[PDB]
Amino acid sequence: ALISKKRKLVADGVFYAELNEFFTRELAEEGYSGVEVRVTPTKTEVIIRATRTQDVLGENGRRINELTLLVQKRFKYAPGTIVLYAERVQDRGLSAVAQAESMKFKLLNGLAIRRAAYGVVRYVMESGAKGCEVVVSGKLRAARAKAMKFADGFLIHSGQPVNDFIDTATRHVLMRQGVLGIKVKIMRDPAKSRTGPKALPDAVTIIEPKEEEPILAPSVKDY
Amino acid sequence: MLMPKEDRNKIHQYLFQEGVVVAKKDFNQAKHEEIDTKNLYVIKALQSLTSKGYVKTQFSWQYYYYTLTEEGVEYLREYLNLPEXXXXXXXXXXXX
Amino acid sequence: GRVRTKTVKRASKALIERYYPKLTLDFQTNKRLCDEIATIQSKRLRNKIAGYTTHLMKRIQKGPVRG
Amino acid sequence: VLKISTRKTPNGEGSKTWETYEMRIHKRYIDLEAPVQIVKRITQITIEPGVDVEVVVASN
Amino acid sequence: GWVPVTKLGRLVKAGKITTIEEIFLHSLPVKEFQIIDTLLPGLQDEVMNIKPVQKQTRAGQRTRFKAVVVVGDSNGHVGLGIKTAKEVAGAIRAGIIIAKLSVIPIRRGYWGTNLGQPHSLATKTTGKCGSVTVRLIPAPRGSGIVASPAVKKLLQLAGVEDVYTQSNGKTRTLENTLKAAFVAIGNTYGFLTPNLWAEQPLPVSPLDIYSDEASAQ
RNA sequence: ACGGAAGGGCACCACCAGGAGUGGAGCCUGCGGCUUAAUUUGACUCAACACGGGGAAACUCACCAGGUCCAGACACAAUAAGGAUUGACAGAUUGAGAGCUCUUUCUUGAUUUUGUGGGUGGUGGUGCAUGGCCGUUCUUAGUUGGUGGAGUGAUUUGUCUGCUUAAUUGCGAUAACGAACGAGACCUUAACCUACUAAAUAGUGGUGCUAGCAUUUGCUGGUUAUCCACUUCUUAGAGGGACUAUCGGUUUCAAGCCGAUGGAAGUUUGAGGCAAUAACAGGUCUGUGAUGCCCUUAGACGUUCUGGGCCGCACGCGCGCUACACUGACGGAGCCAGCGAGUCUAACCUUGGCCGAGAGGUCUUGGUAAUCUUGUGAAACUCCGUCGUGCUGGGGAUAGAGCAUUGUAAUUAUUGCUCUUCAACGAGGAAUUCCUAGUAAGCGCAAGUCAUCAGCUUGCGUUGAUUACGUCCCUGCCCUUUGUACACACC
């Protein structure tokens, strides 16, 4: 124990990234979106968000148990003081990673370049998003490499709200010839934000007045 | 990989007593973390294994993650004892 | 230089038209009036509007302004 | 303010452009004087991810 | 549901206009494609072509798709729609809309003996969409539509049974051939034969009859 | 798309008005060339050349001379319990306590050896097969629907004469109307807050206890809590604040520009982060357990070990550093920063005490840190004194001798110290870089690197200006007009 706070919080941020990488490799076929981490008075809670929880929370505690024991050994956790949890997802249509990997698998499952694109696009779009852009680079029709952009809806690119509302995911897909790139972008709806601002930082809304029939000639009411 | 059997035992006892292996990509380490044999051993002991089924391999941030499959634990029940672990049960909590 | 953008002026016209009695020639009161009858996502913007809206008023009240 | 400053480029080609990242670490302390039940309750009732917590005995 | 934005559509939405001939008669335009929708359902649609065009941007290039659609029943009404957009599907749809707002009437007639329901054309008509001209000549029964595949489909959906075609100019630019084939059979209701010599007294146009039911908000 | 055509604009990677220099000198440093057993390699106009975070003594490490090792998975098949196979003391042998090879003879037991198949690796090739990232066009202002207008059509208009702006920024003109991306908004950081909530890890007033000069009460200190009160200074939460406000001059008396008044702040408040469409065979397979294909895989291009090399020097070139002194040098003395960093199963920042001319040594100490280092007592700078224009005490190259520090290891000098040697350089040809306010310039400092080594970089603050408040003359770009026989688009 006994580590500089400056070094610890970093050292932690390292851990997160090392976990998040791992779980992306192992649990890719389960649609893993991401993880949270929680230091508590005893017990550390690794929370796994995946759209196929049963292949994670496995054969009655199994599988996730491998995944716990795989951890206690790595980072030298005394058993029990760390406990892996399982989530489903907050609608996979809104998560770039779950989508990114979907383009990967779909392409891996032999699908058509343009079809894989639009089919992802249309899932996000019909998941209540504000827009979606999927960009595949690589060797599409072989030889001289090109890049294709399939977008629908609305995006921004510019300042801060790019970090608020849109999250992206770049995934490497290994193919028959070389490799292709899968950059999925998903701009969500500020109207449903919940935590953060509920509009673009330049959306001006004006509440409409009221027709009036003035005069009325003075008068007064007593109680 | 050469290696004696009394070193090849502890590896397979540990690969089932815990059911999973720490690994780490570092040859010339001499002695694992648990397993009192070469870290080179443990790795190339489980390179033969996963190369013939039994256990699955995963590599990230200079660390293999050796996970034992289904057909594996049956290569153990012949190589070790009995027929009636680790990854199958045990539920902690200090209960206090 | 200092040229006010569309989103600014677009709002001023919109505000002025449906709130001329409510608004004055004074920046600060108008500035406040914006928090009631409009929902602006930042302070600088809100002031910038409040500032141009107050600008038109100070010439509206000297003759009708083109738009 | 943690500061990591490097080149945007891999390899070494192009204008000599630099990037600079930050990590912002925020600290504070509160002092309490309370016994048996209020001590173990407050360490745990107030808990939240990302927020590191620590309580100290006293003296030395 | 379709919410009318033109004086025309209201009368059509309400039921105060029941057939399309009412419009052609008073030469009213048509701006809402739903008007003709209601007025004429079961109006089949064939897309005849999709050739890609390309452009040059302040940089490299710009390539996009062009749809040509004909629409019609097969009982006197036809439409031709040219639309080019950023994707196949949308370039088509819009074309179909544009084909329907285009829809036109056709004076079908007897080649000779008037024994029972027209089969060819009133007269010879001809049209010319830049360089390409198509000519339509009345024909005996059984003669059929003697045209190129793309002109025949058009005249089919136009509800024609037999006709003769002479064609001139570069009829390989499919777009222009059709547009003249279109300008052709549209002109059949321009040719003043001596049966239209009779004097009628001019109807008063549903815009004034149902003026009230045509007014808005 | 282009043009050695026209009109407009914008830009200190343009010029005007100037500042500071660079190009001359020596040294540092990268590139070429040359040399070499090797002097590994990428990159070549802006957009290659203190760039590859490339400050390489081993390592790194890819190159050069040599020696080991399999970590050649598994599967089929062959030999082998009359033992597949492993290891090694000695000596010979080798840089070598390598049993690598050999002489003798023990050992050890199905884990290995042989072969085919198939695989594992490679800083081996391919950035002209890719990704990912990045540079560049772009300090630029551009891109795109719907509906309507024009044209057979590709297209066009919308997306514009003028004016305005840093801006397709806006007013307006308007066969267009209404909108989305980019710009703007947004975010960060720096400025104001005697208004709020707080503070022994931040300060201040008073109070004890105590020191000294004065003694007329006073002035100046010490005390980690003596005790109390507070939040001005500090820190950071919550908000406030500016909108170019107010008046005035201009102007389609429109967008706006200018002036003066106040204001913490009136150049997009300063400075950044982010940043559309489309594109380049721009760089990177030597960042990657990212990657296609080729190559090689036990006389290995794999890996490790010993030593050398990347730094080799007739010379070309670029980035720098230190200078030519008197607005200086040297010696005393005054003494003021901000951004930062720091030791767990560990030896990081280090006060203080002693020792040592120094460099450094030794015994202790505090600190995982607003708490200890540290008020980081930094340099420029300020005062006083010496020197007195002389290649001088300016300048500190080259070199000799000695002492220490890092490291296994310092020779081809790692660095630091001390004495001695005292070079070129007397303001730098033709050319040419960078800049408009706390800026330029000067000054040093922390951080990256790092065992040691900064003449490099990323930031920081200290001292602090002259000149502009402009224009298209030069050089780039951008829109429009125009020509085209270009479209792989003036390579």
Ligand SMILES: [Mg+2]
């Ligand atoms: Mg925007």
Ligand SMILES: [Mg+2]
């Ligand atoms: Mg911006």
Ligand SMILES: [Mg+2]
């Ligand atoms: Mg002709």
Ligand SMILES: [Mg+2]
């Ligand atoms: Mg000049």
Ligand SMILES: [Mg+2]
């Ligand atoms: Mg010079």
Ligand SMILES: [Mg+2]
């Ligand atoms: Mg020089």
Ligand SMILES: [Mg+2]
């Ligand atoms: Mg070396």
Ligand SMILES: [Mg+2]
């Ligand atoms: Mg070596």
Ligand SMILES: [Mg+2]
């Ligand atoms: Mg190698």
Ligand SMILES: [Mg+2]
């Ligand atoms: Mg390239």
Ligand SMILES: [Mg+2]
């Ligand atoms: Mg614009």
Ligand SMILES: [Mg+2]
């Ligand atoms: Mg205190």
Ligand SMILES: [Mg+2]
């Ligand atoms: Mg006090």
Ligand SMILES: [Mg+2]
């Ligand atoms: Mg003033």
Ligand SMILES: [Mg+2]
């Ligand atoms: Mg390299």
Ligand SMILES: [Mg+2]
């Ligand atoms: Mg070198």
